[PDB]
Paper text:
To investigate whether ATPase activity is coupled to E3 activity, we disrupted adenosine-5’-triphosphate (ATP) binding or hydrolysis at the two functional ATPase subunits AAA3 and AAA4 of murine RNF21328. K2387A (WA3) or K2736A (WA4) mutations in the Walker A motifs disrupt ATP binding, whereas isosteric E2449Q (WB3) or E2806Q (WB4) mutations in the Walker B motifs disrupt ATP hydrolysis. Suggestive of O-linked ubiquitination, the Lipid A ubiquitination product was unstable at high pH ( > 10). Together, these data indicate that ATP binding rather than hydrolysis is required to activate the RNF213 E3, regardless of whether the substrate is proteinaceous or non-proteinaceous. Consistent with this, the WB4 mutant underwent robust ABP labeling at ~100-fold reduced ATP levels indicative of sustained RNF213 activation and confirming that ATP hydrolysis counteracts ATP-dependent activation. To enforce an ATP bound state, reasoning this might capture the activated conformation, we determined a structure of the RNF213 WB34 double mutant in the presence of ATP. Structural changes relative to the original ABP-complex were less pronounced (RMSD = 1.57 Å). Although ATP could be modeled into AAA4, AAA3 was empty and once again, there was no clear RZ/Ub density and no clear basis for elevated transthiolating activity. Although we do not elucidate the structural detail of the active site itself, our structure suggests ATP binding induces either long-range allosteric repositioning of the RZ domain, or conformational fine-tuning of the E2-docking CTD, to enable transthiolation from the bound E2~Ub conjugate to the E3 active site. The structural rearrangements that facilitate activation might also be highly transient and recalcitrant to our cryo-EM workflow.
The giant E3 ubiquitin ligase RNF213 is a conserved component of mammalian cell-autonomous immunity, limiting the replication of bacteria, viruses and parasites. RNF213 is the largest E3 Ub ligase (E3) in the human proteome, combining E3 and AAA (ATPases Associated with diverse Activities) modules into a single ~600 kDa polypeptide. The cryo-EM structure of M. musculus RNF21328 revealed that RNF213 comprises three sub-modules: an N-terminal stalk, a dynein-like AAA core consisting of six ATPase units (only the two units AAA3 and AAA4 can bind and hydrolyze ATP), and a composite E3 module, including a RING domain. Thus, ATP binding to AAA3 and AAA4 subunits is necessary and sufficient to promote the E3 ligase activity of RNF213.
Author numbering:
A (entry chain A): 4714 to 5150
B (entry chain A): 4499 to 4638
C (entry chain A): 345 to 423, 432 to 476, 487 to 854, 863 to 973
D (entry chain A): 3472 to 3626, 3637 to 3890
Write the structure that this text describes.
Amino acid sequence: FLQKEAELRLVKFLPEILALQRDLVKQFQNVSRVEYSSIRGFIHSHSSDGLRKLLHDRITIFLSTWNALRRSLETNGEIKLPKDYCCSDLDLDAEFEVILPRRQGLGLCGTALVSYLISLHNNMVYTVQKFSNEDNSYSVDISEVADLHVISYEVERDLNPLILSNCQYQVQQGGETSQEFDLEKIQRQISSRFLQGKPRLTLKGIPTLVYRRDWNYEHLFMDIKNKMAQSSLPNLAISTISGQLQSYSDACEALSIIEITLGFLSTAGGDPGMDLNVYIEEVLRMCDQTAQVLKAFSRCQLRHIIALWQFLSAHKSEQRLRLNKELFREIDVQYKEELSTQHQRLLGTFLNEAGLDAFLLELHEMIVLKLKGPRAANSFNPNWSLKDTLVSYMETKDSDILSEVESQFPEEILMSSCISVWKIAATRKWDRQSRGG
Amino acid sequence: TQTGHVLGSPQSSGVAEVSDRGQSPVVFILTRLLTHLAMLVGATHNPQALTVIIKPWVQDPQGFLQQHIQRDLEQLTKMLGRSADETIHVVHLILSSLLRVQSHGVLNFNAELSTKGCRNNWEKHFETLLLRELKHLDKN
Amino acid sequence: RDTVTVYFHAIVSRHFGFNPEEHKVYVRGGEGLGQKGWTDACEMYCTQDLHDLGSLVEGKMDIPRQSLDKPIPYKYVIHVEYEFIYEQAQKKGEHVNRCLRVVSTSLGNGDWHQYDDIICMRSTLDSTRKELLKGKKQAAVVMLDRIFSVLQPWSDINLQSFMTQFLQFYSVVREPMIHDGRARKWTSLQYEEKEVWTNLWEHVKKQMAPFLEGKSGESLPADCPVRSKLTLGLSILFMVEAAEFTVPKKDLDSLCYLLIPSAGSPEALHSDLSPVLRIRQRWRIYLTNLCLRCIDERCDRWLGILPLLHTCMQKSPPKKNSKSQPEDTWAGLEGISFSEFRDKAPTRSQPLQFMQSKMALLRVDEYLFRSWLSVVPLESLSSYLENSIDYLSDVPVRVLDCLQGISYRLPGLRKISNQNMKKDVENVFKMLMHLVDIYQHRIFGENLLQIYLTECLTLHETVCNITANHQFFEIPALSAELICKLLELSPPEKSYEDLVTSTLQEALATTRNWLRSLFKSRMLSISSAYVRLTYSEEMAVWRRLVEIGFPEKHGWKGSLLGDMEGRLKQEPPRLQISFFCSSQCRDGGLHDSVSRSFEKCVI
Amino acid sequence: SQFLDTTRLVQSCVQGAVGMLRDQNESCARNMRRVTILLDLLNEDNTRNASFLRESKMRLHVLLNKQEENQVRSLKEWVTREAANQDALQEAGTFRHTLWKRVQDVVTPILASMIAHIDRDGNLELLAQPDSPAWVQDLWMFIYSDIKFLNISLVSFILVQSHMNLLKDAYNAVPFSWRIRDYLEELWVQAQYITDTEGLSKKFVEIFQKTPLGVFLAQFPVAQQQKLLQSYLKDFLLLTMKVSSREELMFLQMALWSCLRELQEASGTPDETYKFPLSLPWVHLAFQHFRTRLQNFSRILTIHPQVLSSLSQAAEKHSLAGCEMTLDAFAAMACAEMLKGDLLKPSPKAWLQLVKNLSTPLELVCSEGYLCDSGSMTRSVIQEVRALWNRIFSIALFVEHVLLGTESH
């Protein structure tokens, strides 16, 4: 307690800064929609004088406690932050973004402060529990914390008298004045008022705003695979589908419909049965567009949806190949490099003995999910091979044919030219499919 | 990590500079005071080398370390239930007691403080000597 | 806590022969005062000598809170001579005595102020009533003077004490009350609140007069209780508002003169005066109802009340037009219908002269210029822009607010049919280009070029759709000249190139849409064997829209020429040959591109 | 106008709008429910549905009007701009199909944001729930029929957030919970800033009746007004404090109602602010005057889950909460009785942990600072629970001093 009393004295204002964070989160529930340069303009941008003074005193206290605690955050908090935050004494005329509890850029001030406060409170209560109580179940979230639940005291008004009453004077017959601090009475006095009966705080109800736009589609695939026992598409089924979507605008409409239905299914439930027809028509109730796509989806259930999506995506891209149409128009040009004669020769050597149908599909999925253009060399720099990244991406969730792409795939695929391999494979498949009959 | 002398301006209302991961508060305080006065002694010859050593400031080691020492001394006089003269007496006793510690048991540590292990060993021996000499001031 | 402080103020008449040195005064009343009934409850101390009127006397006491909203009988005694009320008792043997009713809701700061009129000694009806009425009038005047003096020094606490004291003063005076068995109004006085506030206004006018003559500070009369003109204006505002009583229209020229921020040009004085007026809610309604009451056919000095209202909100919004809200919020008014005054017969030539007399007021804030932009008549707006050359030279940024204002007012104005506002528009646009190119290119500095480009293109789009007569093409012509000259002035990353490409594309698209829009017909129809254009002055129109110098990497020489060649090709070759040298396609413009295109089409 | 079937457009694009909506991964994801309820309420058969469609039409109109003003008109002239986008043309079949696709993709994010801003906790379910009292739909329409009061912003997977940690199908009884909460909070802030803490109730209620919402609710009859009031206490209690039960929610409901009545009994006989005592602001007033007490009551409800059993008999054997509040006092009484009942049954150490966990709340409730003023019966109750609390605390000290020593040593 005397080790961390200095910072324990400032946990009384944690509800205030937390309420400020809730208000700022609710009032700015967006991304990249901020225009206020300084906090002064933001606070003066309110006609309500009472609300203005509320924000004034709240932000003054927030600034004071942040300045008082901006030393242990770089060394003791469980979140790592750069030193540029605590190097300067922030003022009222400082930048505005700092008061926003983000988690990645310049927003770690409030998050780090509240996390340090809750961490020290939790550590203190945990130590107290493991000292004497040895058991507890009382705990509350940060969504309804009050001034009654936090630990608050004033040294001059409450802490000094309680300890000064526990200074014992002893005198001997010979004449002396010895000072003794009986540990038991002071321990019971301090414990029974401040650090007993307090809840065990958890980090669940933290005021935090969403910074990442959840559009990587990978969490949707994981949610689909975890919620349902997804199954692969039967060969006759996929053959019929490819038969009934030979057009292009048909493929685009199918893409739109399946993307909407996948967006619904990833953030909700779905029975592995209950074929895609009845799911389309009456589960979410959209109107009929074209009988062709419905007749295509008729022979599929929910347990194939993602697989269907991937195949459908490939089909669209594959169509763009036949009509000599620029097939991506979105990806980086650094990957749009032509393979060399030896490269395509080894690629054809692989293609001569390969299950092209699944391989082209998965490789197209890899490009369309990760090779989006900018910000793509972080883990897929155009200097690796394909067998390593393919096996790494497929060992996660795939148990399909693997040995062909690690015992027969080219060892120098030149990832820099990654579209060329799939394009040449698709041309080979199209020639095989069309020129025979 | 974060080597050097990274510290804010002493005129700050922040934390009281509580002890680090593994040191008693009194020993840690005495050790940091001795390190600060050692940096003053070194800077009194070549302030440019210290300017390179300490990261934030570029103007004057002397004034900033003087404010540091003033804060240190006032927190020491707030530390011992003595008089400021008696705090000075205690620090003088501590300083003069480590001169008569000719007993050599300070092996297996580097004399340059270039590694964290040797730095921690130096801190360990410094803690040992500081406690040995602070358990001898009440009766002196 | 259980006691309320009541401050009794009275006047002892000269007929009493009262001497503060020798005679003492007390307030004796029933048990409602908190002391024993009809006993000396509050000692009543003299403060000022009123000469012929008598002696002004003040005192205080503490009454129980249980007495709130209840009638308490009381009278003034002089040490013993009881005060005499010239009223006949309803019940024989009962004493007509003053009634104290402390209003719980009107306590305000917690202290009540009971104002009692001149204390009259019994003279050992109509003439006596008139004399008593005169004495009460003078008493009300002097206590209003005291409430005036309470306002000094200019502080928030003094202002609150002032408003509470004035409320209690009005409540006491407007309804003279007496207590003889039961509290009742003093109807025999016939002192209706009408005459009460007639006397109050006549007293107020003598405080109004000195400031109208230019007196301020030391030059003011030494008996003037209010020293700052703005303070006196706020005081009369508070008094007339709390009573909601009519003001003579002659007195507006005075009361609106008081509120002018004389000797308050720096914003430091207004920021330091803000704490005296911290409440930002009641003052808004007060000032809005003041201006709306002054919106009558005088509307002269009210322009001075805008800065006072405009000194106590947020800072100037730098946002582009059409994004936030219409002119009400941008100018900061939100409560004045300037649309009816900007669009009407401009019989009031005063505002222009007022503005010319108050250049200094334009520096006291930043909302004043934008507010004046949306209120000035359009025909005089060129002179308004001319008068602000110094203001724009001090800060070469207010031209952004000028663009915001014009792009605000222009779409509201109806379609064009006249010649007067033609002169208005050309004059205001020429003053605009003048004030644009004279100063510098620092207007585009600090990365401010993007919003300026957006404002210009929005002005282009919003001014294209008000011209459909092929003779006002000069408005889009100088609009294109304006965008051209603001394109070439900014200093030379690729962001500027992208912005200039997009802006010039939007400009030429808007011009093209306009040219297609007003030309919804054929052209060069013959109908007489003497072929002439259905838009006779169209060719010169083209002539002014092509010479404007734009970067040749862009279009305007491959796009617009294609537009003309598409326009001409529908006409039969014989007809265009006949029109070709019909003495109307004259003016070979020294390798004029349009004449050369005419040549190419004809060959 | 007739230039495009707006109703058809929204009926087609609701699926796209709600498909990208997501809750906090566990807060009753209702995507299929959301689209089903929307299509239930997106027809023209009912006049209520027609009014909803009209209001949605005007809201979409004004939102898009404010939206396109940042465009450079290169997208305002959307037809030609789309046509020049030839890949968009070849992906969308014919030309009219492509125009419809562009319109629906323009409309879908805006409507999704509208659903997110409106369906914060389930406001839509009230309209679809049958036998809904007239005040429900009247207030929902009234709040949905304003601009300044309910201002809607815009912005990928947008987020809709819960405000009360809703249980299974909470469907907040009030048409709008958070908006009314914040509106009344800021009204209280302004009223308390402008005027001192002497006519705080009067100024707050008068500025409540000054707003259009107050004059709207004044037209509601007494029965609907009081049902709306009770639902308002319920939603405010659920929002402010989260309870893991149902009976304790009703206990808090009655406690807050008793506190409100007691506050409405503080003044002797004003007859100017008590002429509309069945009004919304009193709720906030009650909290602002009794929050600590309520908080402590919350604690004594959260610290012991079995005490509710005794509360289960309270109104049955006390008929309490008539004029003033006494539920915290009865909770203290029940806790003291359960202390004095057994004293050894679960375990002496488990007992010691129980009594020490509830030691400090029982100390707080038995404080003169806690009970500033109340009825004399309540004062007698606090004195007797003080006596019983001191007795049980002495027993706890005794056991912790002797039994621990004689069982460990």
